[PDB]
Write an enzyme that holds these catalytic residues in place. Structure first.
Site, short mmCIF file in Angstrom:
data_model
loop_
_atom_site.label_atom_id
_atom_site.label_comp_id
_atom_site.label_asym_id
_atom_site.label_seq_id
_atom_site.Cartn_x
_atom_site.Cartn_y
_atom_site.Cartn_z
N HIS A 1 0.85 -1.23 0.00
CA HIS A 1 0.00 0.00 0.00
C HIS A 1 0.87 1.26 0.00
CE1 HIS A 1 -3.08 -2.94 1.39
NE2 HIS A 1 -3.74 -2.29 0.41
N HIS B 1 -6.52 7.31 -2.85
CA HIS B 1 -7.48 6.35 -2.25
C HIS B 1 -6.86 5.54 -1.10
CE1 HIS B 1 -5.74 2.95 -4.48
NE2 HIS B 1 -6.44 2.19 -3.64
N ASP B 2 -5.52 5.59 -0.94
CA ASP B 2 -4.81 4.86 0.14
C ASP B 2 -3.80 5.77 0.86
OD1 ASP B 2 -6.01 2.35 0.38
OD2 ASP B 2 -4.85 1.51 -1.30
N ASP C 1 -8.67 -1.46 -7.68
CA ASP C 1 -8.07 -1.86 -6.38
C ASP C 1 -7.87 -3.39 -6.29
OD1 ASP C 1 -6.88 -0.74 -4.17
OD2 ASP C 1 -8.56 -1.16 -2.86
N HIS D 1 1.34 1.28 -5.75
CA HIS D 1 -0.04 0.71 -5.78
C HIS D 1 -1.03 1.72 -6.35
CE1 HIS D 1 -3.85 -1.09 -4.74
NE2 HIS D 1 -4.09 -0.17 -3.79
MG LIG Z 1 -7.51 0.91 0.64
ZN LIG Z 2 -5.86 0.28 -2.64
#
Ligand SMILES: [Mg+2]
Ligand SMILES: [Zn+2]
Length: 333
Positions: free
Chosen positions: A84, A124-125, A237, A88
């Site tokens: 992550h 998003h992360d 994802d 990614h």
């Molecule tokens: Mg996530």
């Molecule tokens: Zn992700």
């Protein structure tokens, strides 16, 4: 949150990515990372090239400099964890590009919604520490207690949204600054709805809502568009198993090492350690990949392609090829 310097921008702008087509479903981010000693710069240059090549930022009054500032403000908030990390979210951005433009899912969305998905991929992360929602709840960590107390179990997804809002709050990195009124609200609401939909606890209900809407010719148009955005960020994802087998494999090794580190911390903390997170169970990659293919990824991709997203047939074809390759690994062991 310091301004991005000219020098940080310049180091991205020098990256030329010779021999790479960032728009191709067989693009290889690991090959891209191996290609120089500045992989974080190459990653940023990939995201930049994808965003400009869409032609979208230009149309919504996002300048080349604000776009690149945004990308480097996202990059500074990813951590040195095995899965992550920045690679990614760049991978998810590249993959969504392929679904939109190779898979023709752009035909289902406005240009603004396509621009929002590509941007959302990079937020998003944010500030992921390589621990899942369950780790925070099981250990009663501060962030876990705050989630329980406030009534949102999406520990990490809510935290990721907070840092996205913080980046977009400065005009120098606000890729939505060219928007106002209903368009700016839609940009922020759909970004946030998409990030919250990446919580795998909501997987089944997200997928069922999208399929029920896709099957309904009287579905609310705004609601269909939103669910299509949510399903495309989810698709991105969990896309690792849709890639060429050796790309798919290096992602699965990165995931497994992140899971092992969580299990090590759960062990030294005396909390429940699932088998998947246990170093000393030495569980087989091939079996893990086939399990994930059979129970999560093949049904997800098969159903969205059949319901609505026919242009994404290649995802289903590759998962099938990857499952047969993993079966050959077991057959010859
Ligand atoms: Mg996530
Ligand atoms: Zn992700």
């Amino acid at each position: 949150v310091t301004a991005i310097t000219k020098v940080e921008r310049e180091a991205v702008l020098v990256c030329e990515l010779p021999s790479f087509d960032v728009t191709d479903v067989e693009f290889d981010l690991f090959r891209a990372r191996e290609s120089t000693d500045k992989p974080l710069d190459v990653a940023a240059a990939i995201a930049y090239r994808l965003l400009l090549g869409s032609g979208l930022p230009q149309k919504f009054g996002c300048s080349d400099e604000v776009l690149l500032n945004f990308i480097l403000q996202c990059r500074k908030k990813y951590r040195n964890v095995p899965y992550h990390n920045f690679y990614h979210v760049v991978d998810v951005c590249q993959t969504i590009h392929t679904f939109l433009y190779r898979g023709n899912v752009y035909e289902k969305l406005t240009e603004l919604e396509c621009f929002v998905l590509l941007i959302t991929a990079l937020v998003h992360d944010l500030d992921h520490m390589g621990l899942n929602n369950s780790f925070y709840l099981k250990t009663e960590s501060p962030l876990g207690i705050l989630s329980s107390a406030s009534g949102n179990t999406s520990v990490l997804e809510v935290h990721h949204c907070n840092l996205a809002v913080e980046i977009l709050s400065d005009p120098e990195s606000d890729v939505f600054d060219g928007l106002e009124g209903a368009e700016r609200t839609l940009a922020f609401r759909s970004m946030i709805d998409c990030v919250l939909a990446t919580d795998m606890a909501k997987h089944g209900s997200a997928l069922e809502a999208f399929l029920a809407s896709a099957a309904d010719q009287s579905s609310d148009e705004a609601a269909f568009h939103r669910m299509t955005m949510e399903i495309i960020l989810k698709a991105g994802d969990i896309s690792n198993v849709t890639k060429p087998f050796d790309i798919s494999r290096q992602w699965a090794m990165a995931v497994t090492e992140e899971f092992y580190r969580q299990g090590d911390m759960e062990k030294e903390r005396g909390v429940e350690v699932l088998p998947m997170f246990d170093r000393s169970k030495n569980m087989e990659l091939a079996k893990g990949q086939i399990g994930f293919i059979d129970f999560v990824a093949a049904p997800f991709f098969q159903k969205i392609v059949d319901a609505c997203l026919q242009g994404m047939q290649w995802t289903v074809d590759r998962i099938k090829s990857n499952r047969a390759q993993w079966e050959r690994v077991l057959e010859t062991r």
